[PDB]
Write a structure and sequence with these properties.
structural genomics, unknown function; mainly beta; Tubulin-specific chaperone B; SH3 type barrels; 97 residues; two-stranded antiparallel ribbon; globular; monomer
Length: 97
């Protein structure tokens, strides 16, 4: 009950194309771009599909044979809106310093 409310609230400002940072549980934060926001076929509620900067995801934009977005293998992930912050989150990389 409380979780659905928290997820619905967090999703209101999450738009496809937004840069983002994903923090799932204990894991290291990972940045990418929002590729999907809304309901899916695999579980009820709101999901955020992310196209990650590094191959640190779990999918290729598809889950259970259903395509939701396009990306390379291991660059995609689906997480709950509460685990996603959107804003100016540029790619963590240093060319030369």
């Amino acid at each position: 009950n409380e979780s659905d409310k928290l997820n619905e609230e967090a999703a209101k400002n999450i738009m496809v194309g937004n840069r983002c940072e994903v923090t799932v549980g204990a894991q290291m934060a990972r940045r990418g771009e929002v590729a999907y926001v809304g309901a899916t076929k695999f579980k009820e509620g709101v999901w955020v599909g992310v196209k990650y900067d590094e191959p640190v995801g779990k999918n290729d934009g598809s889950v259970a044979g259903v395509r939701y977005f396009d990306c390379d293998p291991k660059y995609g992930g689906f997480v709950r809106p509460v685990d996603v912050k959107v804003g100016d989150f540029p790619e963590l990389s240093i060319d030369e310093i």
